[PDB]
């Protein structure tokens, strides 16, 4: 019902080969497999289609090649435009899709801390907002503390798109308290883990 | 000119009802099946069925029989496509796409269906200050917190758009509150907080909300 497309996320530097891999279904005939572009905010694109032929308009570093059951999509020389989300599809089955991100090298993030507002707490809430700025990989990990106590259940973070400059994420990790529960505590921080620091990063402030 | 025109953005309770059009021009209506596939935020495609415009018969997703009705007007080249009791993992992107066999070519732009118990509400936009605990180097960073609004989406400017270089403006989250947050932060020089002003620019249309937000130490 879902296809299988590998990997889930694929890095290259603009000018590399890229090549997706789509796994077809066996019970449904395999020969209109079809690839797809989709960029932020766009509707998705046909890029192949009959598994190996290019749709009008569509660039020749394309290309798409199958045998019965595993299907590639081929990308010669990337272009920054080419990094995006990638769907193959077969009748109404659709790949879970893979996402071609820009590979830089390692940075660590620039971890910063805030406060909540004077106007937040007048209204009875306090959001604290831990930033992970210009860091490379995606993957990181935020720890909340009040009073040098680990929190849980009460932060939610966001990531950015991959940036178009510097290829870098930033991250958000925000904590929700009541204006109650903030007032009761001293010290807020945010402790930071990422394969580029050496050791861990802690931002802090006192109320 | 080939396209496909859908309809607006629409806001729905859980148990209501929604139907979307779409609209064909460049191209024999009749000719080609049309097929709704939609997208939930940050997920995959999901294909929902199609109809033969020239013959009203249809085709549907297992999991949508009986909750779904594809119909079509040829005097208008228009396909609709209502769903049913409508429930909150409804919430996507619905788009139409023209049949070119199973290969779908032409692609409307979308239509985003909220779905959920929350009411349209604009945002509480709330200052993240630069300071000491926001520097590094001679870069600060400060922000804006964009919290508590529905539905999506917001747009965030610095300074009317006149300032781009350094923003970062995060995906909104889902609070469990059933209300979207999001903050915007942009990195500046530590020397310009005393004398350049930083303004945020949000704009939440569902509500016809603008909020300017002055952002001081």
């Known amino acids: 019902i879902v296809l299988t497309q590998s990997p889930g996320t694929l890095s290259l530097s603009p000018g590399e080969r890229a090549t997706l891999s789509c796994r077809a279904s066996?019970?449904?005939?395999?020969?209109?497999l079809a690839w797809y572009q989709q960029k932020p905010g766009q509707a998705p694109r046909l890029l192949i289609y009959?598994?190996?032929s290019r749709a009008t308009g569509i660039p020749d570093r394309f290309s798409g090649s199958g045998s019965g059951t595993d299907f590639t999509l081929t990308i010669s020389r990337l272009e920054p435009e080419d990094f995006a989300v990638y769907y193959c599809?077969?009748?109404?089955?659709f790949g879970q899709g893979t996402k071609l991100e820009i590979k830089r090298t390692v940075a660590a993030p620039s971890v910063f801390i805030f406060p909540p507002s004077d106007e937040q707490l007048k209204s009875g809430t306090a959001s604290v907002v831990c930033l992970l700025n210009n860091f490379y990989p995606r993957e990181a990990k935020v720890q909340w503390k009040v009073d040098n106590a680990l929190q849980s259940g009460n932060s939610q973070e966001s990531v950015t798109e991959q940036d178009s400059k510097d290829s870098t994420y930033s991250l958000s990790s925000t904590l929700t308290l009541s204006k109650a529960d903030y007032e009761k505590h001293k010290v807020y921080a945010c402790e930071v883990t990422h394969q580029g620091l050496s050791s861990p990063v802690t931002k802090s402030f006192n109320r | 000119q080939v396209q496909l025109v859908q309809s607006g953005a629409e806001v729905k309770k859980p148990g209501a009802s929604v139907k979307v059009s779409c609209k064909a021009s460049?191209?024999?209506?009749?000719?080609?099946?049309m097929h709704w596939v939609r997208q939930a935020p940050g997920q995959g495609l999901e294909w929902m069925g199609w109809?033969?415009?020239?013959?009203?018969?249809?085709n549907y997703a297992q999991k949508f029989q009986g909750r779904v009705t594809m119909t079509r007007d040829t005097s208008i080249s228009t396909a609709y496509m209502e769903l049913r009791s409508l429930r909150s993992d409804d919430t996507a992107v619905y788009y139409c796409?023209?049949?070119?066999?199973?290969?779908?070519?032409?692609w409307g732009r979308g239509t985003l269906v909220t779905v959920s118990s929350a009411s349209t509400k604009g945002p509480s936009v709330f200052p993240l200050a630069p300071s000491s605990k926001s520097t590094s180097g001679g870069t600060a960073a400060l922000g804006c917190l964009v919290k508590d609004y529905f539905p999506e989406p917001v747009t965030v400017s610095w300074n009317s758009g006149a300032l781009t270089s350094g923003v970062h403006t995060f995906p909104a989250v889902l609070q469990s509150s059933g209300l979207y947050s999001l903050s915007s932060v942009v990195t500046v020089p530590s020397s310009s907080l005393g004398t350049q002003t930083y303004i945020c620019n949000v704009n939440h249309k569902p509500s016809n909300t603008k909020v300017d937000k002055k952002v001081e130490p």
């Open positions: 796409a023209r049949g070119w066999g199973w290969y779908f070519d032409l």
């Open positions: 460049g191209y024999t209506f009749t000719g080609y099946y």
């Open positions: 109809i033969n415009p020239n013959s009203g018969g249809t």
């Open positions: 066996q019970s449904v005939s395999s020969s209109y």
């Open positions: 009959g598994a190996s």
């Open positions: 599809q077969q009748y109404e089955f």
